[PDB]
Amino acid sequence: QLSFHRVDQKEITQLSHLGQGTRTNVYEGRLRVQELRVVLKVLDPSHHDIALAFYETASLMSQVSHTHLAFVHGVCVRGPENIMVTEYVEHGPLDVWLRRERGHVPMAWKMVVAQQLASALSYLENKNLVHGNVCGRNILLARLGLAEGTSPFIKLSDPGVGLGALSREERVERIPWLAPECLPSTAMDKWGFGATLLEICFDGEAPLQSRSPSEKEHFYQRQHRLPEPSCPQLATLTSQCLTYEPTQRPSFRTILRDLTR
Ligand SMILES: CNc1cc(Nc2cccn(-c3ncccc3F)c2=O)nc2c(C(=O)N[C@@H]3C[C@@H]3F)cnn12
């Protein structure tokens, strides 16, 4: 049921460690095709079920195209080792970047990024395909857009190991990006989008970050509302996305409409 390119280990060179993802270590690399800069996502030693969930993500990303979705080149297998080969994006994860640049990222810059992320998720909605890991960490900054007469440009990363295969402990760690219906469909990405807008508004500090797993879990079980930004028109949008009833979240047609005025 899955389709993606098999990458020969001879085709790839591993360079410096960039950090950890869910069950992964991410490295700068080279792919010989020309010697293309890429990232290598090396899966932890894993049960077959996690390996499958990894391949499922490679299959998903290999059959979609959008200018605000990161490219997946394929999967390298090296006996028990699984390596996803994906797009290197120049300025790296947005959450890190916003925390580093805190105090000089204008609202207009943030509204461009919200619009680009909405155009990626509008495309996935129309395809009826779930990302399931929309968050600042998975938004990659291709163009800075701070210089006068420039605009930023983002790429949404592959979601990594499918949410469906992760432990309850890992799902609780992803609150408040995790849709509440996923604690125990594309509607989950509407919640994830809303949480990511708060994260962007708060310069890479998402709500409930300091809170213990039990306190994050109770927040959802009690259906506490997440904070609203002081921009009332953006607050209306985030509050509609962060609605507990999945069927009450707005379409990406409505979201894009609201962001473009
Ligand atoms: C410059 N290019 C680049 C850098 C980078 N860096 C990181 C990858 C993973 C973790 N951390 C990371 N570690 C520890 C603390 C904070 C972090 F952000 C990193 O800094 N990641 C990527 C990716 C990519 O797809 N990354 C996957 C989605 C995760 F970020 C594509 N380009 N690129």
UniProtKB/Swiss-Prot annotation:
Name of encoding gene = TYK2
Name the disease: Immunodeficiency 35: A primary immunodeficiency characterized by recurrent skin abscesses, pneumonia, and highly elevated serum IgE.
All copies of domain Protein kinase, residue ranges: 12-261
- How is the protein altered post-translationally, as described in the entry? Phosphorylated.
Tissue specificity field: Observed in all cell lines analyzed. Expressed in a variety of lymphoid and non-lymphoid cell lines.
Name assigned to this protein: Non-receptor tyrosine-protein kinase TYK2
Positions bearing Phosphotyrosine: 27
Q: What protein family is recorded?
A: Belongs to the protein kinase superfamily. Tyr protein kinase family. JAK subfamily.
User: What does the annotation say about its assembly with partners?
Assistant: Interacts (via FERM domain) with JAKMIP1. Interacts with PIK3R1; this interaction is important for cell migration. Interacts with MPL/TPOR. (Microbial infection) Interacts with Epstein-Barr virus protein LMP1; this interaction inhibits TYK2-mediated interferon signaling.
What organism does this protein naturally occur in? Answer: Homo sapiens (Human)
**Free-text function comment from the UniProt entry:** Tyrosine kinase of the non-receptor type involved in numerous cytokines and interferons signaling, which regulates cell growth, development, cell migration, innate and adaptive immunity. Plays both structural and catalytic roles in numerous interleukins and interferons (IFN-alpha/beta) signaling. Associates with heterodimeric cytokine receptor complexes and activates STAT family members including STAT1, STAT3, STAT4 or STAT6.
